């Protein structure tokens, strides 16, 4: 069709995207493959470099032995976009670069060797915001070190400026990567990769947005989650919803170089509920969650579960499940149990997250959709059919909006709804 979205110059947040026609919840607004992407640090060698799906066995690239793939088809299909980095990842073993450096190498190779990318239809890498005039001296130093890391990692393939795009400035490129990288999660909402999607990068931030993004492998779908009028700006939430206004302030400053004066931030909306319970306990839980989240990122489920049980079933003082640090611990324990086949225990943690997720993901949000699906799935396979049906329907009501027919997970949910329904039809 014609596009439902268009680029425009906002009054005080740079370029943005606005509706061309009225949009309804669930409407597919745009979709994109990445300009460039890579598997993230914790998922390297756990999921396929190309399709970002996990497998019992992954097969390595023989030349570098860093890239790993689910199948001959994926290894072969990845080769054009892996060929030049392969030499650099070999040449610099056992040093592995930061994800941003691997990502930027892929950018450069794509812009030098590939045809114009469909991912740049509305806006290109060259156009992206860098916020160079807002960077602090401390950030500038961090970028200088990323520049030198790139230069080191890439030296086999990029020796000088003749191998970069015209007038390409690596410092500026890394400044763009910082505030335009997308975090790719798998169907289970586990972080698996990072990518650039330059058309999609037009979206500005809201702490109460009107659109959502979801990933199906590296593919990104942008959908409305509220009614949107002609000319109204499209927004997504850049951040985890389980954050206070103070935490959002620090990240939006540090990473994005802006201040938010939205109603939520002006009123510290939900902050008090999020921090209920004794501060001494939740401070310790927040500290333990650095490690728990590190372990989870590397798919270390037994270690995750052990740390989480030490909190959830502590001998010492406990927190309410609506406290965000307690909730994140429940979440990690649920995902660990699911991955370990401890299904009764998974369901216990999962069920406890349901009411806090209802409060903290208002309206239609993909993370709540997927969490409710997980809990309904656990109930279904434990033979709890009426309870399962209610959750699976709720999951469908959310995911029909946030995921839609174009996302394969919706097909999975339809099969569970059918199975649940047959079971009730017999009963
Ligand atoms: C909702 C989901 C969807 C998803 O798959 N990824 C995902 C991406 C982004 C993202 O890229 N933000 C920056 C946007 C660029 C334009 C400036 C945010 C949230 C995400 N999501 C999520 O829940 N996150 C993030 C990842 C953490 N681990 C926790 C919570
Ligand atoms: C991914 S880009 C979004 C598009 C960008 N405005 C542009 O002109 O390319 C991220 C940057 O947009 C700006 N931004 C996004 N959301 C904003 C908001 N709510 N208020 C002010 N600036 C915002 C900041 O410069 C931020 O680092
Ligand atoms: Zn694959
Ligand atoms: Zn290789
Ligand atoms: Zn805000």
UniProtKB/Swiss-Prot annotation:
* Location of the protein in the cell: Cytoplasm; Nucleus
| One Gene Ontology CC term in the entry | nucleoplasm
- Name by which UniProt lists this protein: Histone-lysine N-methyltransferase SMYD3
Q: In which tissues is it expressed?
A: Expressed in skeletal muscles and testis. Overexpressed in a majority of colorectal and hepatocellular carcinomas.
Where is the PTM Phosphothreonine found along the chain? 21
Q: Which family does it belong to?
A: Belongs to the class V-like SAM-binding methyltransferase superfamily. Histone-lysine methyltransferase family.
Q: What is its main location?
A: cytoplasm
Query: What are the UniProt keywords, alphabetically?
Result: Acetylation, Chromatin regulator, Cytoplasm, Metal-binding, Methyltransferase, Nucleus, Phosphoprotein, S-adenosyl-L-methionine, Transferase, Zinc, Zinc-finger
Residue ranges annotated as zinc fingers (MYND-type) are 48-86
Q: How is its activity regulated?
A: Histone methyltransferase activity strongly stimulated by HSPCA.
Q: How does it assemble?
A: Interacts with HSPCA. Interacts with HELZ. Interacts with POLR2A; the interaction may be indirect and may be mediated by HELZ. Interacts with HSP90AA1; this interaction enhances SMYD3 histone-lysine N-methyltransferase.
A Gene Ontology biological process term: positive regulation of transcription by RNA polymerase II
- Binding residue positions for Zn(2+) 2: 61, 64, 82, 86
- Specify the superkingdom: Eukaryota
Which EC number(s) does UniProt give? 2.1.1.354
